[PDB]
Amino acid sequence: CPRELKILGYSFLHVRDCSPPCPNMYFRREELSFARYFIGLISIICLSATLFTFLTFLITRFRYPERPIIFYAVCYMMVSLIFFIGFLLEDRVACNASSTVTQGSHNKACTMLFMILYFFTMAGSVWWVILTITWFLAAVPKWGSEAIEKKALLFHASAWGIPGTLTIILLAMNKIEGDNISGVCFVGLYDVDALRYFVLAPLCLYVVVGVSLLLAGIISLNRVRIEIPLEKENQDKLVKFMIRIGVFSILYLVPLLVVIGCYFYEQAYRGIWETTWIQERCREYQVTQMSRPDLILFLMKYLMALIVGIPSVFWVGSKK
Amino acid sequence: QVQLVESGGGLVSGDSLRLSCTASGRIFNLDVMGWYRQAPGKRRELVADITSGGKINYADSVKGRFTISRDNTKDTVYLQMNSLKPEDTAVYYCNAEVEWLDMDYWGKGTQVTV
């Protein structure tokens, strides 16, 4: 085992200390070479699209009920920014040289990136969920732009506090984890329990709550487009707003459903990458571990994890 | 809804003058609701906006002369035009808005003369 102590210990594979190898960690070398182009070629362009939104935002009576979109854009802007470490340095310190080599829990060479990626990833989801609640108010309630803004400190409290505590709960006795050569410090890439408990579950609960209240908002407006006929001109004028919510919600809920699918795939897969490592390790290399999903699944994993923030552009471009 | 509170202006106020507007056909929370003029001229200009209890905003050439208020259980915006001189001659329009949906409500039927 290329580790013997945290030079917890550093114990990953059912042991006092060990660490899975950095090259050919899971997959074939070839696909890493084109991920080296592709992860950036999608992430930096997604970041370029997302930064324009914040640029326009920094410049229609009030923005109180559309406010969470700004912080959504900021959050996934940062997510894309620190995925841009995919080929930014053209060095891979986060897989430290032979030094906590694979990835160092409780050492600087990894922690400086997980605490931002996980934090902003959770923050963006909470921003979308409370954007759903923001639209829930002033759709079925009788609440105004100023009245909803009066809860803004509670909204910021929840939105920046849930990610804060979910990070606070990942010190020595908890799980800060590594990355592939195409990756940056993040939790759960090698440990299934970290994924199952403190990644997959929050995303699922957020998406569920959003669907709940998003539908109980859109079809709560449904009772108004018809069933009060005196000012027709808004029909197919307020339609632009409803259809914009719908398009935004599709373009958001697609990637999260897909990534939850990918994590459910890994929660039923990684159990066999190991049970056969007893038969691919003890040398260099159920009957096979991975297949064509060697890219076509873990590639759309990162693709959807980055294009969660794309709804911002088709939201802002429909209001000009 | 507006009511015509008119006589001819004062017929050249006497001691004061007020307008009222009131909305009973509503769905969403009227955020900003106020008044607009027209000379009769090529434009319809702003007078005074209220934003549900705050941010009263008078006209950039007329500020510091009028007053505006609002009730909330009854969606009534008021405008008292004290120290009135003729160039206030205009057919006035009460206005209301909901922001996020971008729906604008206009009333009809009020005129002041001198």
Side-chain angles (χ1 to χ4, degrees), chain A residues 60-62 138 142 144-146 231 234 237 241, chain B residues 29 31-32 49 51 55 97 99-103 105:
Chain A
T60 60
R61 308 310 295 268
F62 298 100
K142 185 77 180 294
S145 45
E146 184 164 316
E231 273 184 30
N234 302 296
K237 154 68 188 184
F241 178 83
Chain B
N29 189 359
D31 288 308
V32 180
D49 278 8
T51 74
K55 276 72 60 172
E97 294 168 16
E99 194 276 329
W100 73 101
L101 294 174
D102 191 38
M103 294 182 286
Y105 289 80

mmCIF file with all atom_site columns, all heavy atoms in Angstrom, chain A residues 60-62 138 142 144-146 231 234 237 241, chain B residues 29 31-32 49 51 55 97 99-103 105:
data_model
loop_
_atom_site.group_PDB
_atom_site.id
_atom_site.type_symbol
_atom_site.label_atom_id
_atom_site.label_alt_id
_atom_site.label_comp_id
_atom_site.label_asym_id
_atom_site.label_entity_id
_atom_site.label_seq_id
_atom_site.pdbx_PDB_ins_code
_atom_site.Cartn_x
_atom_site.Cartn_y
_atom_site.Cartn_z
_atom_site.occupancy
_atom_site.B_iso_or_equiv
_atom_site.pdbx_formal_charge
_atom_site.auth_seq_id
_atom_site.auth_comp_id
_atom_site.auth_asym_id
_atom_site.auth_atom_id
_atom_site.pdbx_PDB_model_num
ATOM 1   N N   . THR A 1 60  ? -39.823 45.652 -13.673 1.00 0.00 ? 60  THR A N   1
ATOM 2   C CA  . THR A 1 60  ? -38.414 45.860 -13.360 1.00 0.00 ? 60  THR A CA  1
ATOM 3   C C   . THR A 1 60  ? -38.251 46.842 -12.204 1.00 0.00 ? 60  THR A C   1
ATOM 4   O O   . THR A 1 60  ? -37.180 47.422 -12.018 1.00 0.00 ? 60  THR A O   1
ATOM 5   C CB  . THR A 1 60  ? -37.635 46.382 -14.581 1.00 0.00 ? 60  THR A CB  1
ATOM 6   O OG1 . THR A 1 60  ? -38.188 47.634 -15.006 1.00 0.00 ? 60  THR A OG1 1
ATOM 7   C CG2 . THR A 1 60  ? -37.709 45.385 -15.726 1.00 0.00 ? 60  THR A CG2 1
ATOM 8   N N   . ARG A 1 61  ? -39.325 47.029 -11.435 1.00 0.00 ? 61  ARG A N   1
ATOM 9   C CA  . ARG A 1 61  ? -39.276 47.949 -10.302 1.00 0.00 ? 61  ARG A CA  1
ATOM 10  C C   . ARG A 1 61  ? -38.306 47.457 -9.234  1.00 0.00 ? 61  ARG A C   1
ATOM 11  O O   . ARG A 1 61  ? -37.511 48.235 -8.694  1.00 0.00 ? 61  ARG A O   1
ATOM 12  C CB  . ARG A 1 61  ? -40.677 48.134 -9.717  1.00 0.00 ? 61  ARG A CB  1
ATOM 13  C CG  . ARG A 1 61  ? -41.738 48.514 -10.741 1.00 0.00 ? 61  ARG A CG  1
ATOM 14  C CD  . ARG A 1 61  ? -41.291 49.685 -11.602 1.00 0.00 ? 61  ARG A CD  1
ATOM 15  N NE  . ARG A 1 61  ? -41.125 50.907 -10.821 1.00 0.00 ? 61  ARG A NE  1
ATOM 16  C CZ  . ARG A 1 61  ? -42.077 51.818 -10.646 1.00 0.00 ? 61  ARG A CZ  1
ATOM 17  N NH1 . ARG A 1 61  ? -43.271 51.645 -11.198 1.00 0.00 ? 61  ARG A NH1 1
ATOM 18  N NH2 . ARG A 1 61  ? -41.837 52.901 -9.920  1.00 0.00 ? 61  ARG A NH2 1
ATOM 19  N N   . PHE A 1 62  ? -38.355 46.164 -8.918  1.00 0.00 ? 62  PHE A N   1
ATOM 20  C CA  . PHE A 1 62  ? -37.473 45.585 -7.917  1.00 0.00 ? 62  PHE A CA  1
ATOM 21  C C   . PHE A 1 62  ? -37.110 44.167 -8.331  1.00 0.00 ? 62  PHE A C   1
ATOM 22  O O   . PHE A 1 62  ? -37.822 43.530 -9.111  1.00 0.00 ? 62  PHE A O   1
ATOM 23  C CB  . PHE A 1 62  ? -38.117 45.577 -6.525  1.00 0.00 ? 62  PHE A CB  1
ATOM 24  C CG  . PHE A 1 62  ? -38.440 46.942 -6.002  1.00 0.00 ? 62  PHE A CG  1
ATOM 25  C CD1 . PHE A 1 62  ? -39.729 47.442 -6.080  1.00 0.00 ? 62  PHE A CD1 1
ATOM 26  C CD2 . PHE A 1 62  ? -37.454 47.731 -5.432  1.00 0.00 ? 62  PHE A CD2 1
ATOM 27  C CE1 . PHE A 1 62  ? -40.031 48.701 -5.597  1.00 0.00 ? 62  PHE A CE1 1
ATOM 28  C CE2 . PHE A 1 62  ? -37.749 48.992 -4.948  1.00 0.00 ? 62  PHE A CE2 1
ATOM 29  C CZ  . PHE A 1 62  ? -39.039 49.478 -5.031  1.00 0.00 ? 62  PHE A CZ  1
ATOM 30  N N   . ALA A 1 138 ? -46.285 34.565 -3.500  1.00 0.00 ? 138 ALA A N   1
ATOM 31  C CA  . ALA A 1 138 ? -46.682 35.373 -4.648  1.00 0.00 ? 138 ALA A CA  1
ATOM 32  C C   . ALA A 1 138 ? -47.145 34.525 -5.827  1.00 0.00 ? 138 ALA A C   1
ATOM 33  O O   . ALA A 1 138 ? -47.176 35.005 -6.962  1.00 0.00 ? 138 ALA A O   1
ATOM 34  C CB  . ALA A 1 138 ? -45.560 36.318 -5.099  1.00 0.00 ? 138 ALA A CB  1
ATOM 35  N N   . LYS A 1 142 ? -50.797 35.539 -1.037  1.00 0.00 ? 142 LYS A N   1
ATOM 36  C CA  . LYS A 1 142 ? -50.888 36.954 -1.390  1.00 0.00 ? 142 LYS A CA  1
ATOM 37  C C   . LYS A 1 142 ? -49.683 37.670 -0.784  1.00 0.00 ? 142 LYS A C   1
ATOM 38  O O   . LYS A 1 142 ? -49.749 38.273 0.290   1.00 0.00 ? 142 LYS A O   1
ATOM 39  C CB  . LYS A 1 142 ? -52.203 37.547 -0.901  1.00 0.00 ? 142 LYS A CB  1
ATOM 40  C CG  . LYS A 1 142 ? -52.440 38.981 -1.334  1.00 0.00 ? 142 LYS A CG  1
ATOM 41  C CD  . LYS A 1 142 ? -52.874 39.060 -2.782  1.00 0.00 ? 142 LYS A CD  1
ATOM 42  C CE  . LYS A 1 142 ? -53.100 40.501 -3.198  1.00 0.00 ? 142 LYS A CE  1
ATOM 43  N NZ  . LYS A 1 142 ? -54.252 41.116 -2.480  1.00 0.00 ? 142 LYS A NZ  1
ATOM 44  N N   . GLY A 1 144 ? -46.047 40.113 -1.711  1.00 0.00 ? 144 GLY A N   1
ATOM 45  C CA  . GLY A 1 144 ? -45.474 41.052 -2.646  1.00 0.00 ? 144 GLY A CA  1
ATOM 46  C C   . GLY A 1 144 ? -43.957 41.018 -2.658  1.00 0.00 ? 144 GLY A C   1
ATOM 47  O O   . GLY A 1 144 ? -43.316 40.274 -1.913  1.00 0.00 ? 144 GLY A O   1
ATOM 48  N N   . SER A 1 145 ? -43.392 41.849 -3.532  1.00 0.00 ? 145 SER A N   1
ATOM 49  C CA  . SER A 1 145 ? -41.942 41.888 -3.680  1.00 0.00 ? 145 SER A CA  1
ATOM 50  C C   . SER A 1 145 ? -41.272 42.348 -2.393  1.00 0.00 ? 145 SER A C   1
ATOM 51  O O   . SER A 1 145 ? -40.287 41.753 -1.945  1.00 0.00 ? 145 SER A O   1
ATOM 52  C CB  . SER A 1 145 ? -41.566 42.798 -4.844  1.00 0.00 ? 145 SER A CB  1
ATOM 53  O OG  . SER A 1 145 ? -42.310 43.997 -4.802  1.00 0.00 ? 145 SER A OG  1
ATOM 54  N N   . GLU A 1 146 ? -41.804 43.398 -1.771  1.00 0.00 ? 146 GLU A N   1
ATOM 55  C CA  . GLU A 1 146 ? -41.237 43.859 -0.510  1.00 0.00 ? 146 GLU A CA  1
ATOM 56  C C   . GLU A 1 146 ? -41.515 42.881 0.621   1.00 0.00 ? 146 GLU A C   1
ATOM 57  O O   . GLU A 1 146 ? -40.630 42.626 1.444   1.00 0.00 ? 146 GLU A O   1
ATOM 58  C CB  . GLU A 1 146 ? -41.783 45.242 -0.163  1.00 0.00 ? 146 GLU A CB  1
ATOM 59  C CG  . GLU A 1 146 ? -41.182 45.850 1.088   1.00 0.00 ? 146 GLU A CG  1
ATOM 60  C CD  . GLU A 1 146 ? -41.430 47.343 1.188   1.00 0.00 ? 146 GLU A CD  1
ATOM 61  O OE1 . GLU A 1 146 ? -41.265 48.043 0.167   1.00 0.00 ? 146 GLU A OE1 1
ATOM 62  O OE2 . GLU A 1 146 ? -41.789 47.816 2.286   1.00 0.00 ? 146 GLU A OE2 1
ATOM 63  N N   . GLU A 1 231 ? -59.662 40.153 -18.410 1.00 0.00 ? 231 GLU A N   1
ATOM 64  C CA  . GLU A 1 231 ? -58.541 40.984 -18.919 1.00 0.00 ? 231 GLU A CA  1
ATOM 65  C C   . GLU A 1 231 ? -57.652 40.192 -19.893 1.00 0.00 ? 231 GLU A C   1
ATOM 66  O O   . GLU A 1 231 ? -56.436 40.145 -19.740 1.00 0.00 ? 231 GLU A O   1
ATOM 67  C CB  . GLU A 1 231 ? -57.717 41.575 -17.770 1.00 0.00 ? 231 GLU A CB  1
ATOM 68  C CG  . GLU A 1 231 ? -58.257 42.914 -17.255 1.00 0.00 ? 231 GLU A CG  1
ATOM 69  C CD  . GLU A 1 231 ? -57.377 43.547 -16.187 1.00 0.00 ? 231 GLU A CD  1
ATOM 70  O OE1 . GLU A 1 231 ? -56.154 43.320 -16.220 1.00 0.00 ? 231 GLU A OE1 1
ATOM 71  O OE2 . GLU A 1 231 ? -57.909 44.276 -15.323 1.00 0.00 ? 231 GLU A OE2 1
ATOM 72  N N   . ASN A 1 234 ? -53.511 39.542 -21.019 1.00 0.00 ? 234 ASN A N   1
ATOM 73  C CA  . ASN A 1 234 ? -52.422 38.856 -20.338 1.00 0.00 ? 234 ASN A CA  1
ATOM 74  C C   . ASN A 1 234 ? -52.288 37.402 -20.783 1.00 0.00 ? 234 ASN A C   1
ATOM 75  O O   . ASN A 1 234 ? -51.169 36.899 -20.883 1.00 0.00 ? 234 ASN A O   1
ATOM 76  C CB  . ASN A 1 234 ? -52.620 38.970 -18.832 1.00 0.00 ? 234 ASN A CB  1
ATOM 77  C CG  . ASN A 1 234 ? -52.688 40.405 -18.377 1.00 0.00 ? 234 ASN A CG  1
ATOM 78  O OD1 . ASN A 1 234 ? -51.722 41.153 -18.507 1.00 0.00 ? 234 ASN A OD1 1
ATOM 79  N ND2 . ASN A 1 234 ? -53.835 40.807 -17.858 1.00 0.00 ? 234 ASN A ND2 1
ATOM 80  N N   . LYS A 1 237 ? -49.522 36.620 -22.428 1.00 0.00 ? 237 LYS A N   1
ATOM 81  C CA  . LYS A 1 237 ? -48.525 37.599 -21.990 1.00 0.00 ? 237 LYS A CA  1
ATOM 82  C C   . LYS A 1 237 ? -47.877 37.133 -20.691 1.00 0.00 ? 237 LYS A C   1
ATOM 83  O O   . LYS A 1 237 ? -46.650 37.046 -20.615 1.00 0.00 ? 237 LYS A O   1
ATOM 84  C CB  . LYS A 1 237 ? -49.153 38.988 -21.849 1.00 0.00 ? 237 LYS A CB  1
ATOM 85  C CG  . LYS A 1 237 ? -48.458 39.920 -20.861 1.00 0.00 ? 237 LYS A CG  1
ATOM 86  C CD  . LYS A 1 237 ? -47.072 40.335 -21.334 1.00 0.00 ? 237 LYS A CD  1
ATOM 87  C CE  . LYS A 1 237 ? -46.340 41.095 -20.259 1.00 0.00 ? 237 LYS A CE  1
ATOM 88  N NZ  . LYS A 1 237 ? -45.026 41.575 -20.737 1.00 0.00 ? 237 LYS A NZ  1
ATOM 89  N N   . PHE A 1 241 ? -44.185 34.293 -18.893 1.00 0.00 ? 241 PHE A N   1
ATOM 90  C CA  . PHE A 1 241 ? -43.619 34.007 -17.580 1.00 0.00 ? 241 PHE A CA  1
ATOM 91  C C   . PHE A 1 241 ? -43.776 32.538 -17.200 1.00 0.00 ? 241 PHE A C   1
ATOM 92  O O   . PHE A 1 241 ? -42.822 31.911 -16.719 1.00 0.00 ? 241 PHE A O   1
ATOM 93  C CB  . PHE A 1 241 ? -44.255 34.889 -16.517 1.00 0.00 ? 241 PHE A CB  1
ATOM 94  C CG  . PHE A 1 241 ? -43.754 34.599 -15.142 1.00 0.00 ? 241 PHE A CG  1
ATOM 95  C CD1 . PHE A 1 241 ? -42.571 35.150 -14.704 1.00 0.00 ? 241 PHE A CD1 1
ATOM 96  C CD2 . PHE A 1 241 ? -44.443 33.755 -14.302 1.00 0.00 ? 241 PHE A CD2 1
ATOM 97  C CE1 . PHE A 1 241 ? -42.104 34.881 -13.454 1.00 0.00 ? 241 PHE A CE1 1
ATOM 98  C CE2 . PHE A 1 241 ? -43.981 33.495 -13.057 1.00 0.00 ? 241 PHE A CE2 1
ATOM 99  C CZ  . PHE A 1 241 ? -42.809 34.052 -12.632 1.00 0.00 ? 241 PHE A CZ  1
ATOM 100 N N   . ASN B 2 29  ? -50.568 40.830 -5.854  1.00 0.00 ? 29  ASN B N   1
ATOM 101 C CA  . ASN B 2 29  ? -50.287 41.938 -4.945  1.00 0.00 ? 29  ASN B CA  1
ATOM 102 C C   . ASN B 2 29  ? -49.762 43.117 -5.747  1.00 0.00 ? 29  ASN B C   1
ATOM 103 O O   . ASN B 2 29  ? -48.646 43.085 -6.267  1.00 0.00 ? 29  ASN B O   1
ATOM 104 C CB  . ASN B 2 29  ? -49.287 41.521 -3.875  1.00 0.00 ? 29  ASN B CB  1
ATOM 105 C CG  . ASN B 2 29  ? -49.124 42.571 -2.791  1.00 0.00 ? 29  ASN B CG  1
ATOM 106 O OD1 . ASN B 2 29  ? -49.738 43.635 -2.842  1.00 0.00 ? 29  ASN B OD1 1
ATOM 107 N ND2 . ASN B 2 29  ? -48.304 42.269 -1.796  1.00 0.00 ? 29  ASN B ND2 1
ATOM 108 N N   . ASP B 2 31  ? -47.844 46.052 -6.473  1.00 0.00 ? 31  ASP B N   1
ATOM 109 C CA  . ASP B 2 31  ? -46.627 46.488 -5.802  1.00 0.00 ? 31  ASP B CA  1
ATOM 110 C C   . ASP B 2 31  ? -46.492 48.002 -5.827  1.00 0.00 ? 31  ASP B C   1
ATOM 111 O O   . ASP B 2 31  ? -46.435 48.646 -4.775  1.00 0.00 ? 31  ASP B O   1
ATOM 112 C CB  . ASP B 2 31  ? -45.414 45.823 -6.441  1.00 0.00 ? 31  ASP B CB  1
ATOM 113 C CG  . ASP B 2 31  ? -45.325 44.350 -6.113  1.00 0.00 ? 31  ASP B CG  1
ATOM 114 O OD1 . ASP B 2 31  ? -45.394 44.004 -4.917  1.00 0.00 ? 31  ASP B OD1 1
ATOM 115 O OD2 . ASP B 2 31  ? -45.186 43.537 -7.051  1.00 0.00 ? 31  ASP B OD2 1
ATOM 116 N N   . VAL B 2 32  ? -46.441 48.590 -7.017  1.00 0.00 ? 32  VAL B N   1
ATOM 117 C CA  . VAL B 2 32  ? -46.308 50.029 -7.185  1.00 0.00 ? 32  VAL B CA  1
ATOM 118 C C   . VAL B 2 32  ? -47.569 50.557 -7.837  1.00 0.00 ? 32  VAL B C   1
ATOM 119 O O   . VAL B 2 32  ? -47.987 50.056 -8.887  1.00 0.00 ? 32  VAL B O   1
ATOM 120 C CB  . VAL B 2 32  ? -45.080 50.389 -8.039  1.00 0.00 ? 32  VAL B CB  1
ATOM 121 C CG1 . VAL B 2 32  ? -44.974 51.886 -8.194  1.00 0.00 ? 32  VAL B CG1 1
ATOM 122 C CG2 . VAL B 2 32  ? -43.823 49.823 -7.413  1.00 0.00 ? 32  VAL B CG2 1
ATOM 123 N N   . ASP B 2 49  ? -45.417 57.846 -7.260  1.00 0.00 ? 49  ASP B N   1
ATOM 124 C CA  . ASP B 2 49  ? -45.537 56.411 -7.079  1.00 0.00 ? 49  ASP B CA  1
ATOM 125 C C   . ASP B 2 49  ? -45.321 56.043 -5.622  1.00 0.00 ? 49  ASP B C   1
ATOM 126 O O   . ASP B 2 49  ? -44.480 56.626 -4.936  1.00 0.00 ? 49  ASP B O   1
ATOM 127 C CB  . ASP B 2 49  ? -44.525 55.667 -7.947  1.00 0.00 ? 49  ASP B CB  1
ATOM 128 C CG  . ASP B 2 49  ? -44.998 55.491 -9.368  1.00 0.00 ? 49  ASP B CG  1
ATOM 129 O OD1 . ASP B 2 49  ? -46.037 56.082 -9.725  1.00 0.00 ? 49  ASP B OD1 1
ATOM 130 O OD2 . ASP B 2 49  ? -44.326 54.765 -10.131 1.00 0.00 ? 49  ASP B OD2 1
ATOM 131 N N   . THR B 2 51  ? -44.873 52.424 -3.154  1.00 0.00 ? 51  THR B N   1
ATOM 132 C CA  . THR B 2 51  ? -44.390 51.062 -3.351  1.00 0.00 ? 51  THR B CA  1
ATOM 133 C C   . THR B 2 51  ? -44.761 50.144 -2.194  1.00 0.00 ? 51  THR B C   1
ATOM 134 O O   . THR B 2 51  ? -43.919 49.424 -1.663  1.00 0.00 ? 51  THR B O   1
ATOM 135 C CB  . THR B 2 51  ? -42.880 51.045 -3.568  1.00 0.00 ? 51  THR B CB  1
ATOM 136 O OG1 . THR B 2 51  ? -42.216 51.299 -2.325  1.00 0.00 ? 51  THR B OG1 1
ATOM 137 C CG2 . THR B 2 51  ? -42.476 52.100 -4.582  1.00 0.00 ? 51  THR B CG2 1
ATOM 138 N N   . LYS B 2 55  ? -40.915 54.234 -0.303  1.00 0.00 ? 55  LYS B N   1
ATOM 139 C CA  . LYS B 2 55  ? -40.281 54.653 -1.553  1.00 0.00 ? 55  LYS B CA  1
ATOM 140 C C   . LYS B 2 55  ? -41.182 55.577 -2.366  1.00 0.00 ? 55  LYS B C   1
ATOM 141 O O   . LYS B 2 55  ? -41.225 55.513 -3.595  1.00 0.00 ? 55  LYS B O   1
ATOM 142 C CB  . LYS B 2 55  ? -39.850 53.442 -2.383  1.00 0.00 ? 55  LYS B CB  1
ATOM 143 C CG  . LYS B 2 55  ? -38.491 52.869 -2.005  1.00 0.00 ? 55  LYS B CG  1
ATOM 144 C CD  . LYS B 2 55  ? -38.526 52.147 -0.668  1.00 0.00 ? 55  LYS B CD  1
ATOM 145 C CE  . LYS B 2 55  ? -39.511 50.991 -0.691  1.00 0.00 ? 55  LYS B CE  1
ATOM 146 N NZ  . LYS B 2 55  ? -39.421 50.162 0.544   1.00 0.00 ? 55  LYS B NZ  1
ATOM 147 N N   . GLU B 2 97  ? -49.267 48.105 -10.751 1.00 0.00 ? 97  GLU B N   1
ATOM 148 C CA  . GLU B 2 97  ? -48.335 47.167 -11.355 1.00 0.00 ? 97  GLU B CA  1
ATOM 149 C C   . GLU B 2 97  ? -48.109 45.975 -10.442 1.00 0.00 ? 97  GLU B C   1
ATOM 150 O O   . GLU B 2 97  ? -48.130 46.094 -9.215  1.00 0.00 ? 97  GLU B O   1
ATOM 151 C CB  . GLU B 2 97  ? -46.979 47.814 -11.660 1.00 0.00 ? 97  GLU B CB  1
ATOM 152 C CG  . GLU B 2 97  ? -47.003 48.890 -12.725 1.00 0.00 ? 97  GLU B CG  1
ATOM 153 C CD  . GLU B 2 97  ? -45.712 49.676 -12.780 1.00 0.00 ? 97  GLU B CD  1
ATOM 154 O OE1 . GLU B 2 97  ? -44.705 49.202 -12.214 1.00 0.00 ? 97  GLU B OE1 1
ATOM 155 O OE2 . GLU B 2 97  ? -45.702 50.766 -13.391 1.00 0.00 ? 97  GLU B OE2 1
ATOM 156 N N   . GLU B 2 99  ? -44.877 43.298 -10.410 1.00 0.00 ? 99  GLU B N   1
ATOM 157 C CA  . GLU B 2 99  ? -43.555 43.387 -11.016 1.00 0.00 ? 99  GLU B CA  1
ATOM 158 C C   . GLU B 2 99  ? -43.166 42.089 -11.712 1.00 0.00 ? 99  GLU B C   1
ATOM 159 O O   . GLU B 2 99  ? -42.916 42.078 -12.922 1.00 0.00 ? 99  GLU B O   1
ATOM 160 C CB  . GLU B 2 99  ? -42.522 43.764 -9.956  1.00 0.00 ? 99  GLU B CB  1
ATOM 161 C CG  . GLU B 2 99  ? -41.182 44.215 -10.519 1.00 0.00 ? 99  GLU B CG  1
ATOM 162 C CD  . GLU B 2 99  ? -40.259 43.054 -10.838 1.00 0.00 ? 99  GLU B CD  1
ATOM 163 O OE1 . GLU B 2 99  ? -40.341 42.020 -10.141 1.00 0.00 ? 99  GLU B OE1 1
ATOM 164 O OE2 . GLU B 2 99  ? -39.454 43.173 -11.786 1.00 0.00 ? 99  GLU B OE2 1
ATOM 165 N N   . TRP B 2 100 ? -43.107 40.984 -10.967 1.00 0.00 ? 100 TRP B N   1
ATOM 166 C CA  . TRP B 2 100 ? -42.511 39.776 -11.524 1.00 0.00 ? 100 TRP B CA  1
ATOM 167 C C   . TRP B 2 100 ? -43.294 39.245 -12.715 1.00 0.00 ? 100 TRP B C   1
ATOM 168 O O   . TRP B 2 100 ? -42.703 38.659 -13.629 1.00 0.00 ? 100 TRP B O   1
ATOM 169 C CB  . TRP B 2 100 ? -42.380 38.702 -10.449 1.00 0.00 ? 100 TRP B CB  1
ATOM 170 C CG  . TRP B 2 100 ? -43.655 38.061 -10.027 1.00 0.00 ? 100 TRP B CG  1
ATOM 171 C CD1 . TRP B 2 100 ? -44.125 36.842 -10.412 1.00 0.00 ? 100 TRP B CD1 1
ATOM 172 C CD2 . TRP B 2 100 ? -44.602 38.580 -9.098  1.00 0.00 ? 100 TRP B CD2 1
ATOM 173 N NE1 . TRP B 2 100 ? -45.318 36.577 -9.794  1.00 0.00 ? 100 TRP B NE1 1
ATOM 174 C CE2 . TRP B 2 100 ? -45.632 37.630 -8.979  1.00 0.00 ? 100 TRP B CE2 1
ATOM 175 C CE3 . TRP B 2 100 ? -44.684 39.758 -8.360  1.00 0.00 ? 100 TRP B CE3 1
ATOM 176 C CZ2 . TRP B 2 100 ? -46.731 37.827 -8.157  1.00 0.00 ? 100 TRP B CZ2 1
ATOM 177 C CZ3 . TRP B 2 100 ? -45.776 39.951 -7.543  1.00 0.00 ? 100 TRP B CZ3 1
ATOM 178 C CH2 . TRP B 2 100 ? -46.786 38.991 -7.448  1.00 0.00 ? 100 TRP B CH2 1
ATOM 179 N N   . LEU B 2 101 ? -44.608 39.440 -12.735 1.00 0.00 ? 101 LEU B N   1
ATOM 180 C CA  . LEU B 2 101 ? -45.419 39.039 -13.873 1.00 0.00 ? 101 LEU B CA  1
ATOM 181 C C   . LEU B 2 101 ? -45.478 40.104 -14.957 1.00 0.00 ? 101 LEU B C   1
ATOM 182 O O   . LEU B 2 101 ? -45.811 39.782 -16.101 1.00 0.00 ? 101 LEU B O   1
ATOM 183 C CB  . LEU B 2 101 ? -46.833 38.707 -13.406 1.00 0.00 ? 101 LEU B CB  1
ATOM 184 C CG  . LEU B 2 101 ? -46.893 37.489 -12.497 1.00 0.00 ? 101 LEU B CG  1
ATOM 185 C CD1 . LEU B 2 101 ? -48.277 37.276 -11.943 1.00 0.00 ? 101 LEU B CD1 1
ATOM 186 C CD2 . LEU B 2 101 ? -46.445 36.269 -13.261 1.00 0.00 ? 101 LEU B CD2 1
ATOM 187 N N   . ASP B 2 102 ? -45.156 41.349 -14.624 1.00 0.00 ? 102 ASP B N   1
ATOM 188 C CA  . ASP B 2 102 ? -45.190 42.476 -15.552 1.00 0.00 ? 102 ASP B CA  1
ATOM 189 C C   . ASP B 2 102 ? -46.588 42.675 -16.136 1.00 0.00 ? 102 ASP B C   1
ATOM 190 O O   . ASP B 2 102 ? -46.814 42.580 -17.340 1.00 0.00 ? 102 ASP B O   1
ATOM 191 C CB  . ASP B 2 102 ? -44.148 42.303 -16.657 1.00 0.00 ? 102 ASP B CB  1
ATOM 192 C CG  . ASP B 2 102 ? -43.968 43.553 -17.483 1.00 0.00 ? 102 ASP B CG  1
ATOM 193 O OD1 . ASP B 2 102 ? -44.009 44.659 -16.904 1.00 0.00 ? 102 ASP B OD1 1
ATOM 194 O OD2 . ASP B 2 102 ? -43.784 43.432 -18.712 1.00 0.00 ? 102 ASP B OD2 1
ATOM 195 N N   . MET B 2 103 ? -47.535 42.961 -15.253 1.00 0.00 ? 103 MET B N   1
ATOM 196 C CA  . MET B 2 103 ? -48.879 43.350 -15.647 1.00 0.00 ? 103 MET B CA  1
ATOM 197 C C   . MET B 2 103 ? -49.185 44.733 -15.095 1.00 0.00 ? 103 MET B C   1
ATOM 198 O O   . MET B 2 103 ? -49.001 44.984 -13.899 1.00 0.00 ? 103 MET B O   1
ATOM 199 C CB  . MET B 2 103 ? -49.914 42.340 -15.158 1.00 0.00 ? 103 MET B CB  1
ATOM 200 C CG  . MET B 2 103 ? -49.794 40.990 -15.810 1.00 0.00 ? 103 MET B CG  1
ATOM 201 S SD  . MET B 2 103 ? -51.071 39.866 -15.247 1.00 0.00 ? 103 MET B SD  1
ATOM 202 C CE  . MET B 2 103 ? -50.464 39.506 -13.613 1.00 0.00 ? 103 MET B CE  1
ATOM 203 N N   . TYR B 2 105 ? -51.959 47.881 -14.718 1.00 0.00 ? 105 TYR B N   1
ATOM 204 C CA  . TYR B 2 105 ? -53.375 48.202 -14.663 1.00 0.00 ? 105 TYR B CA  1
ATOM 205 C C   . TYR B 2 105 ? -53.561 49.708 -14.780 1.00 0.00 ? 105 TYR B C   1
ATOM 206 O O   . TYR B 2 105 ? -52.897 50.473 -14.076 1.00 0.00 ? 105 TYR B O   1
ATOM 207 C CB  . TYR B 2 105 ? -53.976 47.693 -13.354 1.00 0.00 ? 105 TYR B CB  1
ATOM 208 C CG  . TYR B 2 105 ? -54.100 46.197 -13.283 1.00 0.00 ? 105 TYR B CG  1
ATOM 209 C CD1 . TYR B 2 105 ? -53.011 45.413 -12.967 1.00 0.00 ? 105 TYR B CD1 1
ATOM 210 C CD2 . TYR B 2 105 ? -55.295 45.569 -13.578 1.00 0.00 ? 105 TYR B CD2 1
ATOM 211 C CE1 . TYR B 2 105 ? -53.113 44.051 -12.914 1.00 0.00 ? 105 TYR B CE1 1
ATOM 212 C CE2 . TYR B 2 105 ? -55.409 44.211 -13.520 1.00 0.00 ? 105 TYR B CE2 1
ATOM 213 C CZ  . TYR B 2 105 ? -54.315 43.452 -13.194 1.00 0.00 ? 105 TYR B CZ  1
ATOM 214 O OH  . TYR B 2 105 ? -54.425 42.081 -13.142 1.00 0.00 ? 105 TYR B OH  1
#
